[PDB]
Amino acid sequence: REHWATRLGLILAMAGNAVGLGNFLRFPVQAAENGGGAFMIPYIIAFLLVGIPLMWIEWAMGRYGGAQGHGTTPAIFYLLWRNRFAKILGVFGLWIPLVVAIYYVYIESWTLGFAIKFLVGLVPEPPPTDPDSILRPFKEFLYSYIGVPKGDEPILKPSLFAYIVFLITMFINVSILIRGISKGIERFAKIAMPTLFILAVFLVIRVFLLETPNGTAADGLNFLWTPDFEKLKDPGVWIAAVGQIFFTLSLGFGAIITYASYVRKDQDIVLSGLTAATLNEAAEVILGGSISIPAAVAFFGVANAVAIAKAGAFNLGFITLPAIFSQTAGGTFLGFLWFFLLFFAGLVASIAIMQPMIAFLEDELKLSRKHAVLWTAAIVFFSAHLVMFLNKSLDEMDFWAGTIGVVFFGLTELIIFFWIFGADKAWEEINRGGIIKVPRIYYYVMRYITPAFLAVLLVVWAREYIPKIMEETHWTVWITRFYIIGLFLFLTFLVFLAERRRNHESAGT
Ligand code: NA
């Protein structure tokens, strides 16, 4: 049973577990939509009150579980709280990261293919003042890549290039994963993370060199870090912030769990945990935030940039930014560094979220790692044809898995641990082996404040928001829902087969 070779590599694998497209694509959008410093106050408080305490919880659960030879939730949950219903609530730990992995690798597939075309100079050349005559070639460029419908039909038809780049991205994930935890993953994490922070810093610097009549890049800064204290009363903001906090730290993914289960029993989660997190927060609020937004706020001024991120998630990353760059000396290459940064950022993140499914096939169904990975790739590859060819199918999985399910699972796994399993046994399992220890106040966050946050939020969500989604939507949503439900069923059948194999051989041995 594998463990992390070196401590730094651990932290670097854990920081790359958190760090990814969320730092770069996602964060700028959620902050732009939610109005800068109006988003940050919630984001920070959520970080302390939710992200922080939740990460230690997931850490401990992973380590505690790995000690018993179990990396995933369906197993671990049985241990903390003994039930057939503990296993069932644990199937969300396989399900969330799987469904997320489905559309996530595909979006990272985009970054790779763009970086490729952007290097070789296959990008479009805009006409030598007007923003729309500028952004359009790139809008068309992305739309041509992912095959956005020209018709009414909710039907995507990606390019032969995008398709093959996905197969490649899939291969590259396999190649990292098939070498295991220390050899495959921990190596790459040591390479990638510095390789990442360097590319980011360079871009941050190079982006600060932008000025137009419309603004400096220091305009975007003071938009992001200067509060609106009135929006403190707006629930949608608080809902947006925690959605970022979860997604950013890979909370509720059953990710931190699986990785941490390869931590040796004695090893400190209480420092390495905090470190890899504070690394991500750097890659988010410091690096990630200081690139995409300030560039647009510089070119188009604030209000227009804010209007671009509302117009789509991929507007800023895949369209606006490379467009801005093309107005500068060697901007096509500076674009390649953008998408190259993204690929490497998503590659550390994607190998993390495909692991839980792999660790399961290993720890439970007793599959060779080679086999665990191939099938995990096969399932993800196949299932994603839905995301690729069906319009807005991507939106659906993001909502159920990486939006709702993550919060549902976070509160769930906090309850199972800090309540059912009991407070102090958990409080011990955390600080145990710790190089340093969790502040006494954080005991009382984990027990009360944290779940009080998630429960109340999950209310203000369900009551004041959700039904419109479940109602107003086009009927193609039921195709994704159908499938990803049959994924839960499929997974539950494996949890079933696992406990059956357990019952049979344990009676013979
Ligand atoms: Na992130």
Task: Please describe what this structure looks like.
Phosphocholine 2 binds at residue 84. The structure is a monomer. The chain has 509 residues and is mostly helical. It has one domain. The protein has 23 helices and no strands. It has helices spanning 7-18, 21-33, 37-67, 73-80, 84-120, 132-145, 160-177, 180-207, 217-224, 235-249, 255-260, 272-287, 292-299, 302-310, 314-325, 331-353, 355-363, 369-389, 393-420, 423-431, 441-464, 467-472, 477-508. Helix 2 (21-33) packs across helix 14 (302-310). The longest helix has 37 residues, at 84-120. The two termini are 20 Å apart. Bound molecules: sodium ion. The site of sodium ion (NA) has 7 residues, from helix 2. Sodium ion (NA) binds at residues 18-20, 22-23, 248, 280.
- Overall number of strands: 0
Structural class: mainly alpha
- Tell me the distance between the termini: 20 Å
The oligomeric status of these chains comes to monomer
Say which molecules are bound, naming each kind only once.
sodium ion
- Main sheet properties: none
Put simply, the count of helices is 23
Radius of gyration: 22 Å
Helix content, binned percent: over 70%
Q: In total, how many domains does the architecture comprise? A: 1
Write down the secondary-structure element order: HHHHHHHHHHHHHHHHHHHHHHH
Sum up the overall morphology in one term.
globular
Indicate the proportion of strand residues: under 5%
Give a quick set of tags describing it.
509 residues, mainly alpha, 23 helices, 76% helix, globular, binds sodium ion, transport protein, LeuT-fold
